[PDB]
């Protein structure tokens, strides 16, 4: 139950100069609801309901976690794009749980794909059918990136089902699996809707953004999830844990490795895009801040179970952790009753 | 000027760490396979349809095909002749795509919709490659197949990105490996080492997945080290992994080369340390791939390493000798005249 967690979290939030200041509560709510309403109606359709084998209460919690993530981090894109992006990332989160074996349904993947026959795996049947709604917002390059990262993600879940953290000595396994399930190219590429950006004019900055952001985004997530993980770890295989197993090092050394990579990633993100196209910098900035805001507020990450355990200290660490947590919750803490309604299950019947 | 001493040291250390030695893979066999793989491929690329849609200069295709068959036969030593032939075709398609400078943009605008609808792709390379892919995929299980499909797709984006001749923005440290993993075919290679006729994908899932994860970095890095000599003065090749480390990380060519060697060596050691005790057939496939991959680099004139074997041919230092020893070893089993297998030329079969 290491409380060192506060130590690392602090220096990061400071370094990136975490402030957020994206949206006005009014705007946040407008977007949260818009995104949720379109996604909710989508998943409530009979076809989605039948092929997407997932516990209702679970689907509902997932959709709300995602709509928040998207709306909070893709702050500069249109409402429609947030909605469609919310549907795609909800599909990925749903899969993130399934314990069903993909093997039998992936045996004719390519032949069915090449022939244009519905994929055997229900998830693929749904994700592919819906994909054009996400791709219509982007140019061919970004679209390719979204397609690939989702394909990688699928493989990542496959591997995860084996709850394998790597052979001891397999130094390369940890990050390999992380990139495989991190959706980094999907995320970093969906940040550039053709409606506001030209892939050909910003090809280099977009490509660079996809490269640098892939690691920032996943590492920052592994760091924010270090609590929710170790706490009630259900035989988890997070990056940090796999670093321990595969690199034969303490859970402290591993955590210190992640934190260092994260601090460096943040440093370089700034030194590179700081002086480039201001509109690119603004999107990257809004993502970083909104992404941190989302992590601190979404319940799923049980970060409250920490604030209510250190609000008493006033030093450097645990002192500012509450100073930041305060900031975030003041713009990011919004009651679900203000946007997430009605529940998916309700629209499903009727 | 070229770091011949430094270079010799790491090469030798690499060959020591991987236990570079002799195999039961005889020259009579090598030639049997070389010719078999080349013959199926040659006939394939000589089909009119292949001839129409695949824009490649004939002589470069002949040379590209000969370099790939060599690589496949020498490294995928434990797979069948059919598997070697089919992988030779696939890896030749990928090598050949580097010869294109045509913007993929317009041919990719409808990529997804055409894919989902089952309509032939607009980019001719995708049309030929997806049409032929089942021939490669039939040798593998679903998991491995998915890796081949993904890596090839990565490769396509890699070639697209390279068309911009971009080494990375100074300060963008994550760019170099991001690009190298993109154009390296690591998961394609790593996964194609396990035909379903010789391995049970599910019974060896952890072994395979681990080999893919570690093989991706060993292969690309070893290749970057081996090609480092032929590209030292090549003003045409401006964006290699090492040249990008120089630009993206803002360090000297030496520091960048120093970065490459450490990664290459640690990769080698961990490869051995991990698979030595695992399933014997697996470690065999892995050990042969490494030895063959190195033999291939040393025997293919494309890399011009004989220029180094000839410069330090008779120096009395240790590394120089240890190198020449290894090199000569490779030449004994690897140095083969193309006239013994690569014939007739693709062009002659095409014209027929």
From Swiss-Prot, chain A:
Q: Which family does it belong to?
A: Belongs to the trichodiene synthase family.
Q: Where is this region: Aspartate-rich domain?
A: 96-100
Activity regulation information from UniProt: Benzyl triethylammonium cation (BTAC) acts as a competitive inhibitor of trichodiene synthase reaction in the presence of pyrophosphate (PPi).
The record's top EC class is lyase
User: Taxonomically, what lineage is the organism?
Assistant: Eukaryota, Fungi, Dikarya, Ascomycota, Pezizomycotina
What cystine pairs are annotated? none
Main function = Trichodiene synthase; part of the core gene cluster that mediates the biosynthesis of trichothecenes, a very large family of chemically related bicyclic sesquiterpene compounds acting as mycotoxins, including T2-toxin. The biosynthesis of trichothecenes begins with the cyclization of farnesyl diphosphate to trichodiene and is catalyzed by the trichodiene synthase TRI5. Trichodiene undergoes a series of oxygenations catalyzed by the cytochrome P450 monooxygenase TRI4.
Q: Which gene encodes it?
A: TRI5
Miscellaneous comment in the UniProt entry for this protein = Trichothecenes are sesquiterpenoid toxins that act by inhibiting protein biosynthesis.
The domain of life for this entry's organism is: Eukaryota
What's the impact of mutating residue 301 to T? Increases the KM for farnesyl diphosphate by about 80-fold, reduces the kcat by about 120-fold, and leads to the conversion of farneyl diphosphate to an approximately equal mixture of trichodiene and an unidentified sesquiterpene hydrocarbon
Which InterPro entries is this protein grouped with?
Isoprenoid_synthase_dom_sf, TRI5_ascomyc, Trichodiene_synth
Q: Which organism is it from?
A: Fusarium sporotrichioides
User: Could you tell me what reaction this enzyme catalyses?
Assistant: (2E,6E)-farnesyl diphosphate = trichodiene + diphosphate
What is this protein's name?
Trichodiene synthase
Mutating residue 300 to K has which effect?
A: Does not cause large changes in the overall structure but increases the KM for farnesyl diphosphate by about 25-fold, reduces the kcat by about 200-fold, and leads to conversion of farnesyl diphosphate not only to trichodiene but to at least 2 additional C(15)H(24) hydrocarbons
In terms of pH, the activity is described as: Optimum pH is 6.75-7.75.
Protein EC: 4.2.3.6
Q: Name one GO molecular function term.
A: metal ion binding
Q: Which CDD domains match?
A: Terpene_cyclase_cis_trans_C1
Sites binding Mg(2+) 2 sit at: 221, 225, 229
């Amino acid at each position: 139950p290491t409380e060192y967690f506060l130590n690392t979290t602090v220096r990061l939030l400071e370094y990136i100069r975490y402030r957020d200041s994206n949206y006005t509560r009014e705007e946040r709510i407008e977007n949260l609801h818009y995104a949720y309403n379109k996604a909710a109606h989508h998943f409530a359709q009979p076809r989605q309901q039948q092929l997407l084998k997932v516990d209702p209460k679970r689907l509902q919690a997932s959709l709300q976690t995602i709509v928040g993530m998207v709306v909070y981090s893709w702050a500069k894109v249109s409402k429609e794009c947030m909605a469609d992006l919310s549907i795609h990332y909800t599909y990925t989160l749903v899969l993130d749980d399934s314990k069903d074996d993909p093997y039998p349904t992936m045996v004719n993947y390519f032949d069915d794909l090449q022939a244009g026959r519905e994929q055997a795996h229900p998830w693929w049947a749904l994700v592919n059918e819906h994909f054009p709604n996400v791709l219509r917002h982007f140019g061919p390059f970004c679209s390719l990136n979204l397609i690939r990262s989702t394909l990688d993600f699928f493989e990542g879940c496959w591997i995860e089902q084996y709850n394998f953290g790597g052979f001891p000595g397999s130094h390369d396994y940890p990050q390999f699996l992380r990139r495989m399930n991190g959706l980094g190219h999907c995320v970093g590429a969906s940040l550039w809707p053709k409606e506001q950006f030209n892939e050909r004019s910003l090809f280099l900055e977009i490509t660079s953004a996809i490269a640098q952001m892939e690691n920032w985004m996943v590492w920052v997530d592994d760091l924010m999830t270090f609590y929710k993980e170790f706490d009630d770890e259900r035989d988890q295989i997070s990056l940090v844990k796999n670093y321990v197993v595969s690199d034969e090092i303490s859970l402290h050394e591993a955590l210190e490795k992640l934190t260092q990579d994260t601090l460096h990633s943040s440093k370089q993100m700034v030194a590179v895009f700081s002086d480039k196209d201001p509109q690119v910098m603004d999107t990257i900035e809004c993502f970083m801040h909104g992404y941190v805001t989302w992590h601190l507020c979404d319940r799923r990450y049980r970060l409250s179970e920490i604030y209510e355990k250190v609000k008493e200290e006033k030093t450097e660490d645990a002192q500012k952790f509450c100073k930041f947590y305060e900031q975030a919750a003041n713009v990011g803490a919004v009651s679900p009753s203000e946007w997430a309604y009605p529940p998916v299950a309700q629209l499903a019947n009727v």
